[PDB]
Symmetry: C4
Subunit: 231 residues, 4 copies
């Protein structure tokens, strides 16, 4: 219903994503002896979409991601008219979460967002595993396209009803289980932007890559489903 | 149906929560080499709500948490009349689980609830990660509000039916994956009270914080859903 | 339909349980550096019930456990007539899995079922954590009763349809996340018997405890649901 | 509908499987300190089927596995006519994923697919745990048969509708939690072939075992369900 409801849902769900997924990375993943690892961060990322696509999916469509919104537009499933408002709402909801995360994070002696990366996406020298830019393009392109094909299929008219938030949220856990070592896993321009702002340095300088590549990837995934798989 | 059924359900489900989530913390999380970590405790917390909201959710609403009950009241989804009886039922069911957990725990040489914290919530000197009180307020406030927005949305008239226990239980796993390092993760006054009693010391002295903050947080989350997202 | 179908389902699902849950313990849990821990064994246990209660639940009821069968009888949900045939079917399906597991396990240099315990349940000197017999009784009694209350509730006429295998399977993961350190987690006489036979020693000598306690526990859980929660 | 849609779905979902499950093994499982282990690889494997059986299951049946396709044929659930086209589609979709994975993997200094095994299945000297060929046959035979019985049951006319992708995907996680130490877990000829090609050596020499055994196993599982459990 009336756009305000949908934009609020998109801003709150993207907030959830960044605060949830990035907070687990910043606060819990490398905690001595008991911390949750990349597996726990990956679970946390997927649970934000699972939980918010259940909570507000009926309201806005449950995108929480500029590449989902744009890929859904290329899949002939979303109107170009509401695209820009969704992306701004996602970025704003994302940023507000990184700021609050940054304040929570600063309450521990020795915190340093620039030096730790603040869960930012990067490649080459700023890839966790030491992976080249090409490794990073290929992975984010395949994983963004795949994510969009799952989103498109699971929300298809003929797919089983009500299960979509499970498929989509879990796809995002999968995607994280594969690619954290390569790019810290983006597949989401709004989530990359939100943390890059607070990292302040290299993250802002590679940010472009995490707009171009997930968006291009989400377009391809949406065109693959629309042209090859749907009717 | 008739209040006795609902209060029994609330007492049993909160019992499940404390015994399940706190028992995994006390007995299994730091077990040498094979223990389950914060990730396993977080899974365990979420599974108590998932499993009991399926089992007794049809009976009482499946709250298991004084902040859920109060936030559901502020969301215009629950009557102020049954609020007090739910909270007492939750606290009583919680306490009975900590006592039984404490007796199970005492059957191993060297157990010491005061010195180990008995999975109690704290801040500052009693935060697992060494996080300030402000870090603790912000996290429990955002995570309580978010939890309440998921609860409100997933149980909305227009949300897919029957899936709510999955969304809500998993939200609680998420919430734990983020915040154990900060406050040992409360979001639940009854769960905090239950373990604080048996820790006996500092936990009882910071207990107030874990009534005020999760309740205030759950109120905001419920008012955000009711005023900004629902109709 | 005609008893043969149901007994086959019970024998195959209990086979799945033992081979799945116990195999993960015997083969994968303590594997150097990459092994799955108690958290992975707990996930594996729950996934056997989740997966078989989906596969054959429509056929037999999906019990896979003599304490479930007996507790379902005490809950006024299962006829005393088919009780004995279910329990024998469970034990037989369990034993066949431990034998096949034992043969798979023997294909690695240095395997020794008596000395490793072969994932057997025990207490006192044969508890993983060094827990007393009383610690073991209390935990298996509370966890068996709780399991039975989840089973009873999730399969209640008024509970959401089709979700029961998720609630029940996950409850069993929970139960394992809490109690592996205490008794290696039984809640299942047939699963205890199956591995005890191949351990050959102390496991057979404490086996009685894992018939009495889970059964008594499952009775209480079923009577709690029938008398306090159902109508 | 018209075969092209189904073959595309099978090729894309098997691509997802290999890239998802094998990529997590190659890129993330042994990552220093934070890596995901066998538990995370097992989760990743199951999530590919869960996510694609939701996305394209309505299109092709959601097989993603030559042993599923053939076992579904032996279960009297799939026509022999479309069997060959499915298997070729699976192998092709698998191979394209291993090539892209191999290129992503090569972007890190010191990568070596022959020397690391490239997540390939093997036995004896090429089993992760040092397990004999007999250990490997028994495990892949029981786990393939079991997988096929879950697939058959969960997609039975009388099983709860829409839940099948959850049961099946999770069964595959289970299967991986048990058997990675034994054979690196195949249960899938197409997934074995895809990585064996890029490993280049011993993997190609034992590849036959991972066609014969999962197929034979999937046949038995399908005949067990059709003859003993279905009508
Ligand atoms: C919806 C608003 C966000 C738009 C995406 C911003 C992309 C950031 O681009 C960065 O800015 C360049 C020039 O100022 C940097 O030098 C460059 O490295 C790029 O990442
Ligand atoms: C919607 C918010 C997007 C903000 C992205 C703007 C890009 C910023 O560019 C970087 O700004 C400097 C920060 O002071 C960096 O030091 C520069 O290297 C520059 O790339
Ligand atoms: C929302 C789209 C983000 C802006 C897209 C930038 C594409 C231009 O290509 C690259 O951009 C530069 C950043 O200013 C890089 O430094 C260049 O190497 C160029 O390849
Ligand atoms: C539903 C009953 C539980 C009510 C909440 C109890 C709050 C506990 O407050 C504690 O008691 C103070 C004074 O006795 C302590 O000194 C203080 O630190 C506070 O945490
Ligand atoms: C429903 C049960 C709530 C119980 C909470 C009461 C608060 C207790 O206050 C603390 O009691 C002493 C225990 O003997 C502590 O030592 C004190 O510091 C005091 O804060
Ligand atoms: C159910 C509500 C619990 C009681 C709320 C107490 C609020 C009062 O604020 C703080 O309470 C004291 C505990 O007695 C603290 O020690 C004080 O610092 C005060 O800030
Ligand atoms: C459905 C058949 C399984 C029945 C349960 C068998 C219980 C095993 O009892 C054990 O046998 C005693 C005497 O032979 C042992 O000494 C005793 O320790 C007990 O555990
Ligand atoms: C349905 C199978 C149940 C089998 C349980 C029988 C109990 C066995 O008792 C033990 O048998 C000896 C094995 O040779 C042990 O050494 C004894 O200590 C005895 O307790
Ligand atoms: C299916 C029920 C299993 C048999 C129940 C045995 C109950 C008897 O109590 C205990 O049994 C002995 C085993 O033979 C113990 O060794 C005794 O200590 C006794 O407490
Ligand atoms: C759908 C096409 C894939 C068919 C399965 C190929 C099986 C590979 O067999 C391997 O080839 C032998 C002879 O060339 C090897 O020496 C042998 O070890 C075998 O694994
Ligand atoms: C559809 C693709 C299936 C490809 C499997 C063919 C088997 C290859 O056999 C192996 O080929 C050599 C690679 O150059 C190995 O060195 C040989 O040992 C041989 O077994
Ligand atoms: C699609 C089926 C794959 C081919 C089946 C081969 C079965 C033959 O048995 C074994 O095959 C040889 C591989 O060429 C082995 O090396 C032999 O030991 C033989 O046992």
């Amino acid at each position: 219903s009336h756009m305000f409801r949908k934009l609020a849902a998109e801003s709150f769900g993207t907030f959830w994503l960044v605060f949830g997924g990035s907070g687990s990375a910043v606060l819990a993943a490398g905690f001595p002896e008991l911390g949750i690892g990349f597996a726990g961060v990956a679970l946390a990322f997927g649970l934000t979409v699972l939980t918010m696509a259940f909570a507000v999916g009926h309201i806005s469509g449950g995108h929480f991601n500029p590449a989902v919104t744009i890929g859904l537009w290329a899949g002939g499933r979303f109107p170009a008219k509401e695209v820009v408002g969704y992306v701004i709402a996602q970025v704003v909801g994302g940023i507000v979460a990184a700021a609050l995360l940054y304040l929570i994070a600063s309450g521990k002696t020795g915190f340093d967002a620039a030096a730790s990366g603040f869960a930012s996406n990067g490649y080459g020298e700023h890839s966790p595993g030491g992976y080249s830019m090409l490794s990073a393009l290929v992975v984010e392109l395949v994983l963004s396209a795949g994510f969009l094909l799952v989103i498109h299929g699971a929300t298809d008219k003929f797919a089983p009803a009500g299960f979509a938030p499970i498929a989509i949220g879990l796809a995002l856990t999968l995607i994280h289980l594969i690619s954290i070592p390569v790019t810290n896993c983006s597949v989401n321009p709004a989530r990359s932007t939100a943390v890059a702002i607070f990292q302040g340095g290299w993250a802002l300088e590679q940010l472009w890559f995490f707009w171009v590549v997930p968006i291009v990837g989400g377009i391809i995934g949406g065109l693959i489903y629309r042209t090859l798989l749907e009717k």
